[PDB]
C-alpha cells in the first residue's frame, strides 16, 4: 500500500487567456501521521522559482491530500523548460521527485459542435445545450460557455475529461442548462474550446440559438 | 484497509430486449494466495437458484480479481427478488456477503436526443453522430445505436457512465463514428435507450437523418 503523488499540467485557458499558468504537485493516500510533508520546487535551468502556495486538506475517505501550486510564466512554459517538484516525507526513506514539461506531439485543432434540445413538457423555461469537441491533440483542453460575452461559472456546465477516440484525437462532451431569463436577455450562446492547437488565438468557437 | 468486492445489477437491455440478465459479483485487490476463493449464490426465497458461470483471471497491476455471473429470471428481478453473493477467502476472518435487488425509487422517463454534425472540412469519409439521454431515474440505463436494423458492436460507439444532471435526473452522452459506406448503404440512424422507467416497452428512441 505504498503512498503516491501526482503532478498536473497547466490548462490552456489558464495558459493563453488568463496568462497565469499554474502547475500543481499534490500527494494522495497519505497515511495520517504527525510527520509534516515538505514540498520544494525547481526548474531544470536553475533559473528563478516563484514561491508556491501550499494547501493541505483532509478528504471524505479519510486520506490526506496535500497540494502545492506554483505559478509559471507563460513564456517559460512555451519555451519548454521542465519543472521538478520534490516531495519529502519523514516516513519515506528517500525523497520523491516528479517532473513536467510542454508536450511536443502532433497537434490537432478542436472541432466544436453546438446542439440545442427541443422544448419538453414540464420544463418550458429551462432548456439544455450540448457541446462536442472533437479531433484534437494533445489531450490538453479547457472548455467554456459564453452567454452574451459573459463567463458562466465553471460549476454551471458539466464537462467530461478527454478520452481517446477510436481513431486519432480525443472527444469531450459538455452539458449546460439555460435559464429562461438568460436567453430572454440574449439568445445566442457560444461554446468555446481553448487548446494549444487552436488558432489564430488558441480559441475555437461555435454558437447555438436556444430556439429559432 | 481491507479487501473489498463490488456487485452490479443487470442492464436493462439484457433484461428487456435480450431477456437474459447479467449479474456480476466481482472481488478486487485480492493479494494473490494459494487459498481458493469460493463464490456462492442464493435468493431471498431460499428456493432453487440457477448455476453461476465462474471466471478467474489476474490483472495488470498484480492484484487478483475473481468474478462470477449468474443468469436470472426477468420477472424474478422485476418482482424484486433479492440476490446474495457470498465470498469466502481464508484470508478473511468471517465470510463476506453482498446483496442487491430492484430499486424502488422514483422513475423518470429517459429523454432521447439524436444529433448529426453537418459535413465540415477535412472528414468527408468519416462522420460523427451524438446522442444525449436526459432526465432518467434510476441510474440504470443501456444505450445503443442500430444501423440498418442491426446491433452494432459495443466497441463501435463510445458512451459515458451516467452523471447526475445540474437539475433533475442523469445524462449520458454517446459518440458514434460512421464510415462513408455505412451511410452510403442506409441513411437512417436511430439512437435508442433502454431503461426501467421507460415505456411502452422500456424503449425510447429518436432518429434523424444525416441532413435535416
Amino acid at each position: 500500500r505504498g503512498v503516491s503523488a501526482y503532478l498536473s499540467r497547466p490548462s490552456p485557458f489558464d495558459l493563453f487567456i488568463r496568462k497565469s499558468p499554474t502547475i500543481t504537485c499534490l500527494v494522495v493516500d497519505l497515511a495520517p501521521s504527525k510527520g509534516t510533508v515538505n514540498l520544494t520546487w525547481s526548474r531544470a535551468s536553475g533559473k528563478p522559482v516563484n514561491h508556491s502556495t501550499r494547501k493541505e486538506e483532509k478528504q471524505r475517505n479519510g486520506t490526506l491530500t496535500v497540494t502545492s501550486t506554483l505559478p509559471v510564466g507563460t513564456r517559460d512554459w512555451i519555451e519548454g523548460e521542465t519543472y521538478q517538484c520534490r516531495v519529502t516525507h519523514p516516513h519515506l526513506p528517500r525523497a520523491l521527485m516528479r517532473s513536467t514539461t510542454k508536450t511536443s506531439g502532433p497537434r490537432a485543432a478542436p472541432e466544436v459542435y453546438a446542439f440545442a434540445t427541443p422544448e419538453w413538457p414540464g420544463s418550458r423555461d429551462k432548456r439544455t445545450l450540448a457541446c462536442l469537441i472533437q479531433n484534437f491533440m494533445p489531450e490538453d483542453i479547457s472548455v467554456q460557455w459564453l452567454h452574451n460575452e459573459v463567463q458562466l461559472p465553471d460549476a454551471r456546465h458539466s464537462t467530461t475529461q478527454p478520452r481517446k477516440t477510436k481513431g486519432s484525437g480525443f472527444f469531450v462532451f459538455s452539458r449546460l442548462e439555460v435559464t429562461r431569463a438568460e436567453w430572454e436577455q440574449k439568445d445566442e450562446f457560444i461554446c468555446r474550446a481553448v487548446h494549444e492547437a487552436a488558432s489564430p488565438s488558441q480559441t475555437v468557437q461555435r454558437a447555438v440559438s436556444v430556439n429559432p | 484497509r481491507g479487501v473489498s468486492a463490488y456487485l452490479s445489477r443487470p442492464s436493462p437491455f439484457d433484461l428487456f430486449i435480450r431477456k437474459s440478465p447479467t449479474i456480476t459479483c466481482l472481488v478486487v485487490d485480492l493479494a494473490p494466495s494459494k487459498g481458493t476463493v469460493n463464490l456462492t449464490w442464493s435468493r431471498a426465497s431460499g428456493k432453487p437458484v440457477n448455476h453461476s458461470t465462474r471466471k478467474e483471471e489476474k490483472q495488470r497491476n498484480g492484484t487478483l480479481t475473481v468474478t462470477s455471473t449468474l443468469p436470472v429470471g426477468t420477472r424474478d428481478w422485476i418482482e424484486g427478488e433479492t440476490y446474495q453473493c457470498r465470498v469466502t477467502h481464508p484470508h478473511l476472518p468471517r465470510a463476506l456477503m453482498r446483496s442487491t435487488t430492484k430499486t424502488s425509487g422514483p422513475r423518470a422517463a429517459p429523454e432521447v436526443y439524436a444529433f448529426a454534425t453537418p459535413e465540415w472540412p477535412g472528414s468527408r469519409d468519416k462522420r460523427t453522430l451524438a446522442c444525449l439521454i436526459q432526465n432518467f431515474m434510476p441510474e440504470d440505463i443501456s444505450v445503443q445505436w442500430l444501423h440498418n436494423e442491426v446491433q452494432l458492436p459495443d466497441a463501435r460507439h463510445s458512451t459515458t457512465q451516467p452523471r447526475k444532471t445540474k437539475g433533475s435526473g442523469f445524462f449520458v452522452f454517446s459518440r458514434l463514428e460512421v464510415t462513408r459506406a455505412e451511410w452510403e448503404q442506409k441513411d437512417e440512424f436511430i439512437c435508442r435507450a433502454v431503461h426501467e422507467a421507460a415505456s411502452p416497452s422500456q424503449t425510447v428512441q429518436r432518429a434523424v437523418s444525416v441532413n435535416p
Epitope: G2, S4, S42, A44, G46, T82, Q84, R86, L92, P93, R94, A95, L96, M97, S99 | R60, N61, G62
Partner: single-chain antibody
C-alpha cells in the same frame, strides 16, 4: 533535454588509479541520487554503488566496498568515481546512472560513456539467451528472480554501443514515445517482456531490473 556525460575511455595498467567523471546537464544536479553500474564481459551489468550529492552520503556493493570511491562537486555539477587495485578481469564498461525514484530503490535514467581497459542475495535469471531477427513475428522474453519481488522490476533497451534505454517501469507501463508494440506483464518470481511485432529499427540487449531488495541485480540480458 536531460543529458549526463561520462568520461572518455581511459587507458590504464594493472595497479593504477582510474578516475571516471559523470557530469549532469538538464536537471538540478543536487536532488537526484546518482548511481554507478559495471558491465563486465561474462558478467551481467551489476550494481557498483550510488551517491547522494546533496548530503555526500555513499552506498556500496559487497564486492566494491573497499576498492571503489565515490565523490561529487556541486559547482561543476559533476560526480566522479575512482578505483585502484585493478585486475585483468576488471576490464569493463562503466555506466553512470540517475535515480528517479519513489522510496528506497527504483528505475534509472542514464547516458553511456564509461570504458575500463587495462593492459594484461537475489539473482535475476533472464532467458532465452538470444533470438535472431524475424520481422513481424512476436518475440517473448522471460525474466525470473529467486525471491518474489512483487512488481519492482524494470526493462531496459541497450543498443550496442549506447546507453540502456528505460522501456518499461514497474513491468506494466511504458515510458512515453515508445511504440505500443512493447508490452510487459508478470508478477512474483516470473516476468515476461513481449514485443508484439519485431522491427529491425529496434534491435538491442534487454536487461532485467530489480528494485525489491539490495543489492540491485540485473539479468544476463537478451540480444537479437
Amino acid at each position: 533535454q536531460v543529458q549526463l556525460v561520462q568520461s572518455g575511455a581511459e587507458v590504464m595498467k594493472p595497479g593504477s588509479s582510474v578516475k571516471v567523471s559523470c557530469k549532469a546537464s538538464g536537471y538540478t544536479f543536487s536532488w537526484y541520487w546518482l548511481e554507478w553500474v559495471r558491465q563486465a564481459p561474462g558478467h551481467g551489468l551489476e550494481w557498483m554503488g550510488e551517491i547522494d550529492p546533496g548530503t555526500f552520503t555513499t552506498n556500496y556493493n559487497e564486492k566494491f566496498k573497499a576498492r571503489v570511491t565515490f565523490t561529487a562537486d556541486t559547482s561543476t555539477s559533476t560526480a566522479y568515481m575512482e578505483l585502484s587495485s585493478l585486475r585483468s578481469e576488471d576490464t569493463a564498461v562503466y555506466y553512470c546512472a540517475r535515480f528517479s525514484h519513489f522510496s528506497g530503490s527504483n528505475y534509472d535514467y542514464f547516458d553511456y560513456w564509461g570504458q575500463g581497459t587495462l593492459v594484461t542475495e537475489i539473482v535475476m535469471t533472464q532467458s532465452p539467451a538470444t533470438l535472431s531477427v524475424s520481422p513481424g513475428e512476436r518475440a517473448t522474453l522471460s525474466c525470473r528472480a529467486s525471491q518474489s519481488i512483487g512488481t519492482n522490476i524494470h526493462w531496459y533497451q541497450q543498443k550496442p554501443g549506447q546507453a540502456p534505454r528505460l522501456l518499461i517501469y514497474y513491468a506494466s507501463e511504458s515510458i512515453s514515445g515508445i511504440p505500443a508494440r512493447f508490452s510487459g506483464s508478470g508478477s512474483g518470481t516470473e516476468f515476461t517482456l513481449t514485443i508484439s511485432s519485431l522491427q529491425s529499427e529496434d534491435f538491442a540487449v534487454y536487461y532485467c531490473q530489480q528494485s525489491w531488495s539490495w543489492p540491485t541485480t540485473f539479468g544476463g540480458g537478451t540480444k537479437v
